[PDB]
Protein backbone atom coordinates (compact mmCIF):
# COMPACT_ATOMS: atom_id res chain seq x y z
CA UNK A 1 0.00 0.00 0.00
CA UNK A 2 1.23 3.51 -1.03
CA UNK A 3 0.07 6.79 -2.76
CA UNK A 4 1.10 10.14 -4.40
CA UNK A 5 0.90 11.87 -7.84
CA UNK A 6 2.27 15.05 -9.62
CA UNK A 7 1.83 16.90 -13.00
CA UNK A 8 5.60 16.56 -13.79
CA UNK A 9 7.15 15.10 -16.98
CA UNK A 10 9.91 12.38 -16.99
CA UNK A 11 12.98 12.79 -19.28
CA UNK A 12 14.22 9.21 -18.49
CA UNK A 13 13.53 6.22 -16.11
CA UNK A 14 15.92 5.87 -13.09
CA UNK A 15 17.41 2.62 -11.68
CA UNK A 16 15.25 3.18 -8.51
CA UNK A 17 11.69 4.07 -9.76
CA UNK A 18 8.73 2.83 -7.54
CA UNK A 19 6.98 1.00 -10.52
CA UNK A 20 9.78 0.49 -13.12
CA UNK A 21 13.01 -1.50 -12.62
CA UNK A 22 16.05 -1.62 -14.95
CA UNK A 23 16.87 -5.36 -15.44
CA UNK A 24 19.27 -7.62 -17.42
CA UNK A 25 18.23 -11.09 -18.64
CA UNK A 26 20.76 -13.79 -17.54
CA UNK A 27 21.54 -17.45 -18.38
CA UNK A 28 22.23 -20.71 -16.41
CA UNK A 29 25.76 -19.33 -15.49
CA UNK A 30 24.43 -15.81 -14.60
CA UNK A 31 26.08 -14.10 -17.66
CA UNK A 32 24.43 -10.97 -19.04
CA UNK A 33 22.58 -11.34 -22.38
CA UNK A 34 20.37 -8.23 -22.88
CA UNK A 35 19.11 -5.17 -20.91
CA UNK A 36 15.42 -4.15 -20.37
CA UNK A 37 12.93 -2.31 -18.09
CA UNK A 38 10.51 -4.44 -16.04
CA UNK A 39 7.17 -2.70 -15.32
CA UNK A 40 4.82 -3.68 -12.45
CA UNK A 41 1.20 -2.44 -12.76
CA UNK A 42 -2.27 -3.68 -11.66
CA UNK A 43 -2.90 -5.25 -15.14
CA UNK A 44 0.21 -7.57 -15.59
CA UNK A 45 4.07 -7.79 -15.80
CA UNK A 46 5.72 -6.22 -18.91
CA UNK A 47 9.32 -6.09 -20.28
CA UNK A 48 10.44 -3.11 -22.39
CA UNK A 49 13.65 -3.30 -24.52
CA UNK A 50 15.10 -2.26 -27.98
CA UNK A 51 13.34 -2.21 -31.48
CA UNK A 52 12.55 -5.94 -30.71
CA UNK A 53 8.98 -6.95 -29.68
CA UNK A 54 7.88 -6.21 -26.06
CA UNK A 55 6.97 -9.17 -23.76
CA UNK A 56 4.03 -9.68 -21.36
CA UNK A 57 3.00 -12.09 -18.51
CA UNK A 58 -0.38 -12.00 -16.60
CA UNK A 59 -0.23 -12.62 -12.82
CA UNK A 60 -2.54 -15.67 -13.41
CA UNK A 61 0.38 -17.37 -15.27
CA UNK A 62 2.83 -16.71 -12.34
CA UNK A 63 2.60 -19.99 -10.36
CA UNK A 64 5.75 -18.81 -8.47
CA UNK A 65 7.84 -15.56 -8.24
CA UNK A 66 11.26 -15.54 -6.47
CA UNK A 67 14.12 -13.25 -5.39
CA UNK A 68 17.79 -13.67 -4.30
CA UNK A 69 20.98 -11.52 -3.96
CA UNK A 70 20.73 -9.15 -6.99
CA UNK A 71 18.53 -11.82 -8.81
CA UNK A 72 14.80 -11.87 -9.77
CA UNK A 73 13.05 -14.85 -11.50
CA UNK A 74 9.61 -16.34 -12.41
CA UNK A 75 8.05 -19.62 -13.73
CA UNK A 76 5.29 -19.64 -16.45
CA UNK A 77 3.16 -22.34 -18.18
CA UNK A 78 2.82 -23.15 -21.93
CA UNK A 79 -0.25 -20.79 -22.28
CA UNK A 80 1.70 -17.43 -22.26
CA UNK A 81 3.40 -15.30 -25.04
CA UNK A 82 6.90 -16.89 -24.57
CA UNK A 83 5.69 -20.45 -23.83
CA UNK A 84 6.77 -22.85 -21.06
CA UNK A 85 10.00 -21.75 -19.27
CA UNK A 86 11.78 -19.99 -16.37
CA UNK A 87 13.20 -16.48 -16.99
CA UNK A 88 15.82 -14.86 -14.69
CA UNK A 89 17.10 -11.28 -14.46
CA UNK A 90 19.93 -9.48 -12.64
CA UNK A 91 18.62 -6.39 -10.74
CA UNK A 92 19.91 -4.24 -7.81
CA UNK A 93 16.28 -4.07 -6.42
CA UNK A 94 15.05 -7.72 -6.79
CA UNK A 95 13.62 -7.69 -3.20
CA UNK A 96 11.65 -4.43 -3.88
CA UNK A 97 10.21 -6.17 -7.01
CA UNK A 98 9.27 -9.21 -4.83
CA UNK A 99 7.72 -6.88 -2.16
CA UNK A 100 5.63 -5.06 -4.86
CA UNK A 101 4.54 -8.22 -6.81
CA UNK A 102 2.72 -9.69 -3.79
CA UNK A 103 0.93 -6.27 -3.27
CA UNK A 104 -0.62 -6.52 -6.80
CA UNK A 105 -1.00 -10.36 -6.87
CA UNK A 106 -3.06 -10.28 -3.61
CA UNK A 107 -5.24 -7.51 -5.19
CA UNK A 108 -6.54 -9.53 -8.26
CA UNK A 109 -7.61 -6.27 -10.12
CA UNK A 110 -11.09 -7.70 -11.10
CA UNK A 111 -11.94 -5.75 -14.30
CA UNK A 112 -10.23 -2.65 -12.67
CA UNK A 113 -10.16 -1.01 -16.18
CA UNK A 114 -12.47 -1.40 -19.24
CA UNK A 115 -10.84 -4.07 -21.48
CA UNK A 116 -11.59 -4.72 -25.24
CA UNK A 117 -13.39 -7.84 -26.64
CA UNK A 118 -11.56 -11.12 -25.68
CA UNK A 119 -12.05 -14.91 -26.34
CA UNK A 120 -13.56 -15.33 -22.78
CA UNK A 121 -16.90 -14.34 -24.48
CA UNK A 122 -19.58 -16.99 -25.26
CA UNK A 123 -18.90 -18.89 -28.56
CA UNK A 124 -18.26 -22.41 -30.04
CA UNK A 125 -16.54 -24.99 -27.69
CA UNK A 126 -12.74 -25.52 -27.92
CA UNK A 127 -9.65 -26.71 -25.95
CA UNK A 128 -9.60 -24.35 -22.91
CA UNK A 129 -7.96 -24.65 -19.43
CA UNK A 130 -9.80 -26.56 -16.65
CA UNK A 131 -10.39 -25.39 -13.00
CA UNK A 132 -9.36 -27.08 -9.69
CA UNK A 133 -10.79 -30.50 -8.61
CA UNK A 134 -11.43 -32.09 -5.13
CA UNK A 135 -9.35 -34.97 -3.71
CA UNK A 136 -11.31 -38.31 -3.94
CA UNK A 137 -12.36 -39.90 -0.56
CA UNK A 138 -11.15 -43.26 0.86
CA UNK A 139 -13.31 -46.45 0.78
CA UNK A 140 -14.41 -48.55 3.84
CA UNK A 141 -14.06 -52.36 4.33
CA UNK A 142 -16.47 -54.98 5.77
CA UNK A 143 -16.58 -57.83 8.40
CA UNK A 144 -16.83 -61.61 7.72
CA UNK A 145 -19.50 -64.18 8.76
CA UNK A 146 -19.26 -67.73 10.33
Amino acid sequence: GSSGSSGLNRDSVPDNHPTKFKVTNVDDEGVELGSGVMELTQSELVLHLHRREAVRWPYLCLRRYGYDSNLFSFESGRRCQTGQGIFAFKCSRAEEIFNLLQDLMQCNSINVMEEPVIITRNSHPAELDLPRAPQPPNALGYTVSS
Partner: peptide, 19 residues
Protein backbone atom coordinates in the same frame (compact mmCIF):
# COMPACT_ATOMS: atom_id res chain seq x y z
CA UNK B 1 14.74 -14.36 -23.09
CA UNK B 2 16.82 -17.34 -21.81
CA UNK B 3 14.86 -20.49 -20.77
CA UNK B 4 16.40 -21.93 -17.53
CA UNK B 5 16.55 -25.66 -16.63
CA UNK B 6 15.27 -25.11 -13.02
CA UNK B 7 14.25 -22.33 -10.55
CA UNK B 8 17.30 -20.27 -9.27
CA UNK B 9 15.54 -19.23 -5.98
CA UNK B 10 14.93 -21.18 -2.70
CA UNK B 11 12.62 -18.60 -0.96
CA UNK B 12 9.24 -18.12 -2.75
CA UNK B 13 5.58 -17.27 -2.09
CA UNK B 14 3.12 -19.28 -4.27
CA UNK B 15 0.43 -16.79 -5.45
CA UNK B 16 -1.87 -18.36 -8.08
CA UNK B 17 -3.02 -22.01 -7.59
CA UNK B 18 -4.46 -22.22 -11.18
CA UNK B 19 -2.84 -23.53 -14.45
Amino acid sequence: LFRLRHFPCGNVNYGYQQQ
